[PDB]
Nucleic acid binder design. Structure first.
Ligand SMILES: [Mn+2]
Ligand SMILES: [Mn+2]
Ligand SMILES: [Mn+2]
Ligand SMILES: [Mn+2]
Ligand SMILES: [Mn+2]
Lengths: 238, 236
DNA sequence: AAGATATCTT
DNA sequence: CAAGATATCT
């Protein structure tokens, strides 16, 4: 499928190529930094050509937000099925030591999930799937000078791993951020995201949970986690 | 000076080079995107070796944050006087052809000496802003021989180095993330320092006492004139 | 002015 | 974990 081919292409590109710098049209290269702000951007730009190639191979149109601050990073759709759009979002996180547990922030829970056209390229109800291409990397004089046309240039990361999974599948029950009201993913090992070991039973449960999750702990008398939500649901949503 | 040599070096590097992609050790090039989140990152990495070069020429050690989410991008200090550090922070904004920058939070290091800062705030004697302004303009890969044909995600870029206080405005630059907003002016005003604050003392005091929401501010002050009136009322 | 867009630190 | 930080934009 488009999906099996997408993840295959991503997993494969990550194996065969290592980003190591920014290059100008004149051939001068500037090294990269080791913080997530830099790597998330690098990993996303590294993903863009692959995502588009595969989509074109499957007859899908690819569209990126025309305006900034609009989810998702990529919208894939066939003209023939305008209401079956697929949102693909690239997310990145780090770890100081490989194999440790990781967590991702999975977008806000007060924008498009609560409002059909809020901060999304197309209305939420036109997408039938929301995929997450998650990247994980172990943080790592040389990075201070410029280089000319590779191999010597030090790479600010170690053991980059990539996965593709449904957002609802890896969604957790605890916020991924406070003042920016983000859904938090499960806090588990990379293998757990690949195998889809989340906490919701269905996409509808994930949606209902985040659509009724309160903004601050002061959730006290509603629900703060999946167990409480199920009890809340059992009682009649009150 | 270090400042004049840095400003010059910045201008020259900007005139001489156009970043056009990310390159792998294998020679394959991925193009750049056209949003601030991407450009801010590129403009900053572009700034690093030059800031480091001039610092070396002047005998300053350069330190970047070891920890994420800590101001500033670059901490410079001479090995003899460690208590007189210079903070250099890169900021970026776009133009579809008057501009404004967010200038960092007003509830972190300026209210607490050790909050979100690499070194105590009181060890810094200067806070410089290297501002990049770009006019907003592929999904294919390229090789070295195709450098000149890689589409740039910007039509033109202008860079400036000014003191933070000098370009600071009086309205926030963000709400839930409580950032100071710069003045809303033309690129030339940032270069020439046509601010609103009478002094860095006034800038600091204004942002250290700016309330987070309009409700709170409406009892104190929402702009420069009101803060001045608040001062006269005895800071009450 | 308030709150979105992406992640991380305390 | 929560809350609030990191950078910008809508
Ligand atoms: Mn994007
Ligand atoms: Mn993304
Ligand atoms: Mn962890
Ligand atoms: Mn919109
Ligand atoms: Mn700290």
């Amino acid at each position: 499928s488009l999906r099996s081919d997408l993840i295959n292409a991503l997993y494969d590109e990550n194996q065969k190529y290592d980003v190591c710098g920014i290059i100008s049209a004149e051939g001068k290269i500037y090294p990269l930094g080791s913080d997530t702000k830099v790597l998330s951007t690098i990993f996303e730009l590294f993903s863009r050509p692959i995502i588009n190639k595969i989509a074109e191979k499957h007859g899908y149109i690819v569209e990126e937000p025309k305006q900034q601050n609009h989810y998702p990073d990529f919208t894939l759709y066939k003209p023939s099925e305008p209401n079956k759009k697929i949102a693909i979002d690239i997310k990145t996180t780090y770890t100081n030591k490989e194999n440790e547990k990781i967590k991702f922030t999975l977008g806000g829970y007060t924008s498009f999930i609560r409002n059909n056209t809020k901060n999304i390229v197309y209305p939420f109800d036109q997408y039938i799937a929301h995929w997450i291409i998650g990247y994980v990397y172990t943080r790592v004089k040389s990075s201070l000078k410029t280089y000319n046309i590779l191999n010597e240039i030090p790479k600010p990361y170690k053991g980059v791993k990539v996965f593709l999974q449904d957002k609802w599948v890896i969604a957790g029950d605890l916020a991924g951020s406070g003042n920016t009201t983000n859904i938090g993913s499960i806090h588990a090992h990379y293998k757990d995201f690949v195998e889809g070991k989340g906490i919701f039973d269905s996409e509808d449960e994930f949606l209902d949970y985040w659509r009724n999750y309160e903004r601050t702990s002061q959730r006290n008398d509603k629900y703060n986690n999946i167990s409480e939500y199920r009890n809340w649901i059992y009682r009649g949503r009150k």
